[PDB]
Design a binder for this molecule. Sequence first.
Ligand code: ZN
Ligand code: ZN
Ligand code: ZN
Ligand code: ZN
Ligand code: ZN
Ligand code: ZN
Ligand code: ZN
Ligand code: ZN
Lengths: 264, 264, 264, 264
Amino acid sequence: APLPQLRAYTVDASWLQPMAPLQVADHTWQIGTEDLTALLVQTAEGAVLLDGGMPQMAGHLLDNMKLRGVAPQDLRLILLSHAHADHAGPVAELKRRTGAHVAANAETAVLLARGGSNDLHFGDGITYPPASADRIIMDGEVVTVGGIAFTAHFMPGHTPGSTAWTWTDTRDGKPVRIAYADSLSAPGYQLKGNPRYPRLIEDYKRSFATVRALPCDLLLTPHPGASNWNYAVGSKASAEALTCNAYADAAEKKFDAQLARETA
Amino acid sequence: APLPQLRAYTVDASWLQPMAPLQVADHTWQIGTEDLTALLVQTAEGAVLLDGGMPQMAGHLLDNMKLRGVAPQDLRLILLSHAHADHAGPVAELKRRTGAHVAANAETAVLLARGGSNDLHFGDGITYPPASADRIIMDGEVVTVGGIAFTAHFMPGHTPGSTAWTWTDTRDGKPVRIAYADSLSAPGYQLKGNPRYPRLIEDYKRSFATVRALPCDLLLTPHPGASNWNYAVGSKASAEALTCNAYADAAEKKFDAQLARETA
Amino acid sequence: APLPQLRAYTVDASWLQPMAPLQVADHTWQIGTEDLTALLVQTAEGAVLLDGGMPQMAGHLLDNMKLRGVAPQDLRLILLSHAHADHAGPVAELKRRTGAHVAANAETAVLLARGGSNDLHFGDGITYPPASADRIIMDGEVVTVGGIAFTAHFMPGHTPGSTAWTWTDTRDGKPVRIAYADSLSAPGYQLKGNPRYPRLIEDYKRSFATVRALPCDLLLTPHPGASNWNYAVGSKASAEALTCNAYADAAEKKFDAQLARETA
Amino acid sequence: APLPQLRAYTVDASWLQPMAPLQVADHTWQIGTEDLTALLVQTAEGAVLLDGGMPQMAGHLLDNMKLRGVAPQDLRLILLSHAHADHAGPVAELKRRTGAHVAANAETAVLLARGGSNDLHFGDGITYPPASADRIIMDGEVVTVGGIAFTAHFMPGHTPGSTAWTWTDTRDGKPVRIAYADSLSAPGYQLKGNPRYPRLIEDYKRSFATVRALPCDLLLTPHPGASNWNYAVGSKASAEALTCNAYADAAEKKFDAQLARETA
Ligand SMILES: [Zn+2]
Ligand SMILES: [Zn+2]
Ligand SMILES: [Zn+2]
Ligand SMILES: [Zn+2]
Ligand SMILES: [Zn+2]
Ligand SMILES: [Zn+2]
Ligand SMILES: [Zn+2]
Ligand SMILES: [Zn+2]
């Protein structure tokens, strides 16, 4: 009776289905897969990438960047929602090939440093190549790249270092407030009485309130299904998209019902 | 046509076959699996562990330590051959559970820090939970734990931070010189003209000469088959074991023949 | 006109005045200097150190530990208030000499990793030898060492990773609730409108409320003068000591008055 | 009798005397101080910086880069001789302000990670703000930036991670082989029988032989006085400059004489 073999992190086939760069705003593009958000912001002084998806999406991200006229050396900064394998995967490879920097808070940095290992809920289940953060950011700190200001918003819950990013773009001159809120889900988490996360419920409840008060005209999420986005249809992607109020309120109803069954 | 899924590091069933602590010397024990060496040295001032095997062997290593009367808090130091997944796997977990420290050279430390990712030959193929080295050691530096002195010997080749450890034990009072030499194999390595390892042949040839001149009465290797060890038979394990001269000479003949076919 | 020379972090002569181990409880001792708190907790399964003082206090801390019958290998864990040079100094040296581990939250870990450099308020003014945290702890997480449970309490303000530690000891059988609250001061900090710490006032106000509700029968602080402690008199040290309510209320009055003059 | 205060790393006034960018080749410039070499290489695809000097030279380096038409975002890579305070000082600050990457071997990376603390010879005497290396390089590995190839040459001795960099430039079309060899000095080092560096003499002797065989038409050193450079005179700076043979032979004569007096 030998010890069990290692098990790879296998996901849905749609999480790895490549797609052409979809336009969200004048300067905002979606260059990830169909069911994994990877946003690219093009400025006059460089490019910014928000999340990267699965670790094997590094070649796909660089393919779409060159379709947008972005060279590897043009990627100046990498921002992350939370440091999980399905969002912060190719960060280690994109730093080696793009000369880019990574900005994240302390909790996302310590999780990114150990490649998602020793997860508070998953343990060593979703390990990815480790990367290092080059700039530590705080709650409400503004990050400016090429005239575009990215404001951070701490929304801890899914991970201790979950961060929502808000920035203002344009749609043919008309300004648009874009808010990239992180996942408000707890799949299989022990909510009440967790010794690894003693204040998990408090942070989740406080995150529901933070997501509602986000300056937002167009909401996106790391998983497009969480915000009723459909990257596949293309032009009608943001048709049935939800609001910040609708997103936080729907995520809170699932949270309380899950917390209610946990006590049972 | 989606992107390919992640692939787990699967090994032979014998690499994960647990075994009872096998006695090598008065203070030296083998607490790993049948085809993966994990040595335990028991002293009056603590315990020393040399290598740990596959990442899923952490529970097995702690099981055999308690069979030897070693508590988790008694493990003072962890030494490594080279920082690969099949030898330096459970190091991250054993540091969390044993309060132990890790001593390695700079090359093994930088490889252990990124969990084997960006391997010079394997890339991101054999990623394991990342660990940190607490003490940087140099070539020939002596590490003393409880009156037992561990002398390091740099033998670069398999990895840039490959290290052979030599220490003197006893066999009912009679002293025994034990040498734990690292792997001298290059499975699938590009030997000549490697841009990631330009001086690979020089380090390999210089390592063959370093292994021969090791003070050794009983030679062990991270893979027992490389030194003609058979942990399964038990008492007759060290019967057909090879010498340092035989180990280095046999490994050099395979190296030159492999290098000869590479040019073809 | 050459560039200015480097300037060392010079403190008061009383911060570096050694003293004999002062007894606080049955298992709690003060082994630092006269005006720098360094607490030692002796258990049946090891010793715990809370803070270490100035970087040059490493030899003094080890001197008092041996006076308490504590060997270097007996120090199992190191806990910190905040990762500044006058409190987390000798941590890098004590890890090399004691085989101990360091537990801290993510913010204290990222600050300890860069040796206090790039401080949000001091910059590169108070750089100390960098150390690494071996275990990341969360708000309210319990850390047990030898039957004594240390509960963490996040009180951000002085540093983003400021932590108050609470544990229950005895005084000849009678239990005593000890609370080691961090500094609630902001010397020279820009409170309102700080781009490096946008939510500084909110964290300070929320920390005043967290310090009041701490389970405490005897309050200590990293600076004994902040809690009206006098390590010099010895037996009458805790005579005029303040309560958690008195400490938080007095620190809040200085904070609001400082904030009021900042707007002027 | 209090403990001694911290002591800052004070150097000569000439090590911090700023100077205008001095031209060494068509693409190579000296932008450091009078007695501290800091080389800037300008390419069509970015800029490369070799060494940075004292930690307080970060503002001076950025001043000269803008005089050369180099923006902070144009600095793509930072290369180092060895990770000491007088050469790898402002690396931590230049990474925050230039978006640049650092490439170094494993030994220079582990020394740069702890800010020069726990030096094998100086201990915690010359601590500087810690930085992280983004790319690990090996002996003889080529680093290409904008058509200019930088070849590394390991010359261990002064530090375990001492590296000489060689690249070919032009002087009005005519090619020039530039070799930037590291310091071959051991000021106050214990050469024979050092437990922290057991193989120090072997590495020094092997480094003397490596410096002689360097492809070099114009030799520079981190200290211009070591290679008979005089950055002050300007045009006649490289007049009395030494060869690689002269540099290694003169450094070896001082080494053997120092080793001879050590035994006395
Ligand atoms: Zn997730
Ligand atoms: Zn996810
Ligand atoms: Zn291997
Ligand atoms: Zn192997
Ligand atoms: Zn302080
Ligand atoms: Zn202080
Ligand atoms: Zn030096
Ligand atoms: Zn120097």
